[PDB]
């Protein structure tokens, strides 16, 4: 009933994307809440937040996150000029999504050490169309499904290692899945 796309719900921006593989139900709830239920999904990512995001937003989230297989829960966003995709990963399922990415260093924020990484995406889908761009990762060592993310600590850590922010695009708390099943119910503020 909610199809892949973007828009606003109950005051919050939301984005939902899938590869058309079937097996994902994304729902928007009251306020900053969204749920995802999935079963033998393909690749998807969806959630609530802001458009545009900012370089110093403190993002609060709370709820339940129950992946069965490949999945992660993150602050997810994009920047323009240069085109950048980024993830501050708060929890993941059966696969560490930083695997294969180049480690850049570490940062401490909001009660955990994070490992930071970058990888190059070549001719991949993006907010401006097929493109080659860098994808930044900050992966929390102490997994959780509630908390507060001071995005500035991660942007500062990435910038130390090559990141430049031109103009911010969207910035959401998102659940990603990749050929897996699960449920999640997350509220953003």
């Amino acid at each position: 009933t909610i199809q892949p796309g973007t828009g606003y719900n109950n005051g919050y921006f939301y984005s939902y994307w899938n590869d058309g593989h079937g097996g994902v139900t994304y729902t928007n709830g009251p306020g900053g809440q969204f749920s995802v239920n999935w079963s033998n999904s393909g690749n998807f990512v969806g959630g609530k937040g802001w458009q545009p995001g900012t370089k110093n937003k403190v993002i609060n989230f709370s709820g339940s996150y129950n992946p069965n297989g490949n999945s992660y829960l993150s602050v997810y966003g994009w920047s323009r000029n240069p085109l950048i995709e980024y993830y501050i990963v708060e929890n993941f399922g059966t696969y560490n999504p930083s695997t294969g990415a180049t480690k850049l260093g570490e940062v401490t924020s909001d009660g955990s050490v994070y490992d930071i990484y970058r990888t190059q995406r070549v001719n991949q889908p993006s907010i401006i169309g097929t493109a080659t761009f860098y994808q930044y990762w900050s992966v929390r060592r102490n997994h959780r499904s509630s908390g507060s993310v001071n995005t500035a600590n991660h942007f500062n850590a990435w910038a130390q290692q090559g990141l430049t922010l031109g103009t911010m695009d969207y910035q959401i708390v998102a659940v990603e899945g990749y050929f897996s099943s699960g449920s999640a119910s997350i509220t953003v503020s």
Copy 2:
């Protein structure tokens, strides 16, 4: 001893420096060598084989105490194509793969290694000044003793399209770069 190559107590050795001063390379009994350095320039030296092989299992043991920029590695070259390579087992204050292009990961001898390549442009080499690629495997679990199955690295590199030519020397080496330290390493 002075910068050069040779054999000592059954082992090939190579010692190179940039002329800056501040480093002593010493050959010891059997497969042992030591390095002591203090405000050095750039150097690399150690013991092993000439030529090395693409399936050698290399054993090293001892003490490695860098104070600054340094690494401990299986170090060697191939010819045709000219390739310089490092399987880095430990390092000091700087990750020598910094800025190199990551090609993948390989698990070997008790650790995940990150695999990289970079290009050296008009740089010193075993055949003179040249431009050539440099392959890296960098151990995540740092150690100063252990066993290196070189085939696991060479095969992983090949899978990422990193061809090796005819093998030249292959040693366990201590490198330093504008730093101080001591090391005592025995190869077998």
